[PDB]
Amino acid sequence: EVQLVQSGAEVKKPGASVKVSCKASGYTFTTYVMHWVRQAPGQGLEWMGYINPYNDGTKYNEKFKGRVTMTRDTSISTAYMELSRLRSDDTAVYYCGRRNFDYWGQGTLVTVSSASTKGPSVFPLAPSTAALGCLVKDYFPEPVTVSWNSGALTSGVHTFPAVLQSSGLYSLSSVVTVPSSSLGTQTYICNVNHKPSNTKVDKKVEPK
Amino acid sequence: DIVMTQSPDSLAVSLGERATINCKSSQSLLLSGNQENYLAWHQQKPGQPPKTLITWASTRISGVPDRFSGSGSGTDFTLTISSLQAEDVAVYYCQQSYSAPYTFGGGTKVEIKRTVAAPSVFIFPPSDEQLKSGTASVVCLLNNFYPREAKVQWKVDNALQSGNSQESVTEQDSKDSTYSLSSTLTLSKADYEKHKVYACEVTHQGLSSPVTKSFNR
Amino acid sequence: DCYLGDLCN
8 A cells, every 4th residue: 555654743933944754655755756735724725846756856836935845865765845934824734645646645734823832711601402512712732622521412512613813822612402401400511621731621511 | 827616616415416526727737748637636524634536537546436437628627426425525626737836626515415404593691700801702603504604793782793703613414414603702801891782693594584692791 | 657747858
């Protein structure tokens, strides 16, 4: 099997640089060029350039001609991509693709932010069939996962994609719809996990 | 640069039904020297890496099921799914490999088609704990609706809000094929306490006229 | 294998 295995996710501050690798197996590395393609969140795919390992030749998109450099190491079958002077809209998942884009790497998320690791504040979305939930606000970086009643309540739960607010911090909501008659007696607790900050929050949501 | 234009932008299709995605290029992708078309089709699921389905406009990638096929030449290409499966729900991209930059189409979202379902609408005042903290997040929830198009308009003492809210939408539910939507109106404490009626007004074709949900501070 | 339109010359 052909396999393109990329390095892991990076978080960088504006102005920094990031070098991402892509190791290729299952075929002869120098036989095909290696492209880099990126995808900003919620947008399409955009070609950045390639390197031809056979002759060390490169071809860049005129959008990163003066910022990106590609390299290769034939003896370990690895192509690299370096993006310098990282700005905030370089936040994307970066992919390597081989040949005529017939096989893809798994992607490398690169987050460019002036924010620091910060655990979330959690607030109730109180009810008054009824709806209730939790507001998970002002955290960084992604991700937060949410469960309800320690994973015992899964029907009717929608945990929404996080949104990046003006502050560089993320905010999401998790809701669930429940029998209105259960609000007297059944206890609902959202379990918010934030691995980056080694924080876990449990919030009990009650009628006010 | 070559411009790749797909059509439609999103395609609702019943399970087992034929799906057709079209892709047009601002330039012929058919090299006359070897009579080949330089066009690929990629499949991508929410938060997943691309996966190639077709290359050379009509050659199926090894291991892609038979129900996928590519066709067309020059400037007009088509991805066909003969009988849509649940696992086929995804975004589909065409991408020219003829001349650099190797540009992608805008993508075509393919979703399961279902009967219209109006949203349930719920509004949530900010919690006192956050409020006394300096910020007011007012949340409006649109629960299990179809199709995805759902307009939310915040009104504060009946004045339309603009520029102070953000929205988020779930992926199409695997069991009932609906979408849900969350919208958050954010104000400072000081502005929040200057007004009385906080309202969420929802327009959706499952609703004859718009539904407003509200509360008084 | 000229797998891109502008790869060969």
